[PDB]
Amino acid sequence: KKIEPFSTLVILRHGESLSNLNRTYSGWYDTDLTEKGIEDAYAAGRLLKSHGFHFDVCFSSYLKRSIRTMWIVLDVLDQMHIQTISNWRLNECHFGLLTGMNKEQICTTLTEEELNIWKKDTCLQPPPCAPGQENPSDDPKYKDLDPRVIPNGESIDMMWERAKPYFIDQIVPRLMEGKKVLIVAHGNVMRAMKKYLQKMTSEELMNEKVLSNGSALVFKFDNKFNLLETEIISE
Amino acid sequence: KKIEPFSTLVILRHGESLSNLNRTYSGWYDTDLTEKGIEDAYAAGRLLKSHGFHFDVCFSSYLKRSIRTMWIVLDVLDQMHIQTISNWRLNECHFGLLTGMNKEQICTTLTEEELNIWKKDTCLQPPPCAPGQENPSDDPKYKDLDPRVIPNGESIDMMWERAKPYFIDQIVPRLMEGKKVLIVAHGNVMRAMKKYLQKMTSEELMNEKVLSNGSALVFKFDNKFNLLETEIISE
């Protein structure tokens, strides 16, 4: 038998989306799961069930690929009744002009020095959506957002600047009360949360490899919210 | 063009469940949607979309047939991001001993006079689950419930006694703030809510025919929460 931690945070990357399959940046673009991405969500649900997770609450972004993955996972876990919370502050970076582009054209758009910052750091900010470009933030779901908080082109640093207050104000307090929390996250959001919890720097984070779709991080905490262990579980 | 009401409450019956297909009482038993029931949920989603509903929040019970219907409907509406709340106080009656029985054996169990109260009124209370009977309230999802609030055999009156405080305390205030609310409900819960909002008596309610799976009631209110109109929309 094993000792259970005081609280647990599982962060799961959502399954493959259509933009991911097309190799095109999505960001706030609301691309849905593919057939494979749906099977990724079921596989992640079976993965979490075999590890015996029973969650008290689940968090997702406003993006369908995150929400649909969350619903499938809870379906597999037989926990469809638990509190689910969706908030735009957990959204992936708003890629602005890069929204919808092939992930290979950015070598053309960016100088060689700029490309180095894009992959090795988190401070490079994409330019805003061009005139006439379909801006995902114009979707009616964001109509209640204050225009001054709506991003148009976000570096990973800027994304974390808006997501961190939500993490600290809504998610951390539940972990401090001994809750088991699931977050179905986007790749960059998960990386930022890992850097914060483990006290890494930007360079170490981008050195690490990206977790495949459906892979999960498990953070375990004691009653003082000290980090006790990080595990990577994957299909 | 038409005048929009100050607030709107849509109550939708969930799709066919396996217990409904088998013609067996479910109550708190957590029977899931059949293939037809899933298509009922998609059809109800298309029905609500053609009427132009944009909801601010959705409510369901703790039962999977309600929750899954809610998720499908929001999927069709492209409103998967909206606040969803699941609460056991919106659960169907706990049928106690009758849980799992064929809906035809109750003629044997009940005297002829008792059967008349069962169909024409709402005050008849089923007996509790028998020893050794699988009681749905023993499911781990109710472990945080106070044992004194857990029902074991509920008349429709008793069910409404526990659901009404939740309706008044959580749902009505949102309608009074001009919200559009969706509730994916069970048949008896929807009937009780209709009786309360329209100020009917128990006898008139049970005289009315039951709404088919996937049919919806639309209540419209002004800014004083006076009932302006009730419509029935169905596939």
Side-chain angles (χ1 to χ4, degrees):
Chain A
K1 206 77 226 73
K2 176 62 85 72
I3 306 307
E4 277 257 290
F6 173 82
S7 67
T8 306
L9 171 64
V10 182
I11 311 178
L12 169 71
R13 172 128 164 93
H14 58 71
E16 170 182 286
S17 72
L18 186 55
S19 297
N20 197 251
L21 179 65
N22 288 348
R23 291 147 173 198
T24 65
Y25 286 110
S26 54
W28 280 35
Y29 181 69
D30 203 13
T31 178
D32 207 355
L33 297 177
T34 63
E35 256 203 62
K36 179 190 166 31
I38 286 168
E39 178 47 53
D40 293 340
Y42 278 95
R46 290 191 297 271
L47 166 62
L48 300 180
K49 172 153 96 145
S50 67
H51 278 82
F53 289 116
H54 296 272
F55 298 107
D56 300 294
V57 60
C58 188
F59 289 91
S60 75
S61 69
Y62 261 28
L63 301 171
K64 295 212 300 311
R65 58 198 189 264
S66 171
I67 299 165
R68 192 181 300 284
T69 294
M70 158 170 77
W71 289 354
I72 291 167
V73 161
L74 296 181
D75 184 7
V76 173
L77 291 165
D78 199 10
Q79 298 171 35
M80 290 162 69
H81 61 277
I82 71 165
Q83 189 181 14
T84 69
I85 298 165
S86 289
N87 199 275
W88 68 267
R89 286 177 171 271
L90 298 180
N91 276 14
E92 176 72 299
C93 299
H94 185 294
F95 284 123
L97 175 68
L98 278 40
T99 305
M101 298 200 336
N102 292 285
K103 308 202 192 173
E104 293 69 20
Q105 212 183 304
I106 63 157
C107 307
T108 321
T109 305
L110 300 184
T111 67
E112 254 290 330
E113 177 220 310
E114 282 177 343
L115 242 186
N116 284 310
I117 310 194
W118 188 252
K119 316 310 264 165
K120 299 182 182 181
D121 213 334
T122 53
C123 59
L124 198 58
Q125 173 184 356
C129 291
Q133 181 176 6
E134 185 187 338
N135 189 334
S137 67
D138 288 339
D139 192 301
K141 67 168 86 164
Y142 304 111
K143 67 200 160 69
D144 296 337
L145 268 70
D146 183 333
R148 317 163 55 208
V149 317
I150 293 172
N152 202 350
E154 273 182 319
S155 67
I156 291 171
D157 287 348
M158 283 155 91
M159 176 273 282
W160 179 240
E161 252 186 299
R162 62 154 164 85
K164 180 180 180 181
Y166 186 78
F167 180 75
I168 295 181
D169 294 347
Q170 282 296 311
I171 300 177
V172 167
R174 296 178 156 99
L175 292 169
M176 273 155 35
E177 294 187 12
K179 306 295 186 198
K180 288 70 217 183
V181 178
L182 174 61
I183 303 176
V184 180
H186 309 275
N188 289 319
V189 180
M190 163 176 340
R191 278 187 282 279
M193 284 178 190
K194 185 183 184 179
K195 172 179 169 298
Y196 172 71
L197 293 174
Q198 295 182 349
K199 289 143 181 311
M200 291 162 59
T201 77
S202 285
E203 310 307 325
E204 310 146 73
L205 168 64
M206 306 303 291
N207 273 337
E208 317 197 303
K209 200 208 174 298
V210 315
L211 251 56
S212 67
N213 292 323
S215 307
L217 291 159
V218 181
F219 304 89
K220 301 175 164 182
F221 306 92
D222 66 7
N223 51 37
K224 290 153 66 71
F225 197 63
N226 302 133
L227 181 62
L228 308 175
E229 183 181 10
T230 304
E231 316 183 23
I232 313 195
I233 62 179
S234 298
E235 186 74 4
Chain B
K1 206 77 226 73
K2 176 62 85 72
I3 306 307
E4 277 257 290
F6 173 82
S7 67
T8 306
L9 171 64
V10 182
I11 311 178
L12 169 71
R13 172 128 164 93
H14 58 71
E16 170 182 286
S17 72
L18 186 55
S19 297
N20 197 251
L21 179 65
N22 288 348
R23 291 147 173 198
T24 65
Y25 286 110
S26 54
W28 280 35
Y29 181 69
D30 203 13
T31 178
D32 207 355
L33 297 177
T34 63
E35 256 203 62
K36 179 190 166 31
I38 286 168
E39 178 47 53
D40 293 340
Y42 278 95
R46 290 191 297 271
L47 166 62
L48 300 180
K49 172 153 96 145
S50 67
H51 278 82
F53 289 116
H54 296 272
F55 298 107
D56 300 294
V57 60
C58 188
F59 289 91
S60 75
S61 69
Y62 261 28
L63 301 171
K64 295 212 300 311
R65 58 198 189 264
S66 171
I67 299 165
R68 192 181 300 284
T69 294
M70 158 170 77
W71 289 354
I72 291 167
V73 161
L74 296 181
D75 184 7
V76 173
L77 291 165
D78 199 10
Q79 298 171 35
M80 290 162 69
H81 61 277
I82 71 165
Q83 189 181 14
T84 69
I85 298 165
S86 289
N87 199 275
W88 68 267
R89 286 177 171 271
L90 298 180
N91 276 14
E92 176 72 299
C93 299
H94 185 294
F95 284 123
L97 175 68
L98 278 40
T99 305
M101 298 200 336
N102 292 285
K103 308 202 192 173
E104 293 69 20
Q105 212 183 304
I106 63 157
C107 307
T108 321
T109 305
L110 300 184
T111 67
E112 254 290 330
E113 177 220 310
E114 282 177 343
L115 242 186
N116 284 310
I117 310 194
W118 188 252
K119 316 310 264 165
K120 299 182 182 181
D121 213 334
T122 53
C123 59
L124 198 58
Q125 173 184 356
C129 291
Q133 181 176 6
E134 185 187 338
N135 189 334
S137 67
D138 288 339
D139 192 301
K141 67 168 86 164
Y142 304 111
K143 67 200 160 69
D144 296 337
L145 268 70
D146 183 333
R148 317 163 55 208
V149 317
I150 293 172
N152 202 350
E154 273 182 319
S155 67
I156 291 171
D157 287 348
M158 283 155 91
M159 176 273 282
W160 179 240
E161 252 186 299
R162 62 154 164 85
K164 180 180 180 181
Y166 186 78
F167 180 75
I168 295 181
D169 294 347
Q170 282 296 311
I171 300 177
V172 167
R174 296 178 156 99
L175 292 169
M176 273 155 35
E177 294 187 12
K179 306 295 186 198
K180 288 70 217 183
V181 178
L182 174 61
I183 303 176
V184 180
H186 309 275
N188 289 319
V189 180
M190 163 176 340
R191 278 187 282 279
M193 284 178 190
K194 185 183 184 179
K195 172 179 169 298
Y196 172 71
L197 293 174
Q198 295 182 349
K199 289 143 181 311
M200 291 162 59
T201 77
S202 285
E203 310 307 325
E204 310 146 73
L205 168 64
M206 306 303 291
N207 273 337
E208 317 197 303
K209 200 208 174 298
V210 315
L211 251 56
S212 67
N213 292 323
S215 307
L217 291 159
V218 181
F219 304 89
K220 301 175 164 182
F221 306 92
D222 66 7
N223 51 37
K224 290 153 66 71
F225 197 63
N226 302 133
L227 181 62
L228 308 175
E229 183 181 10
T230 304
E231 316 183 23
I232 313 195
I233 62 179
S234 298
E235 186 74 4

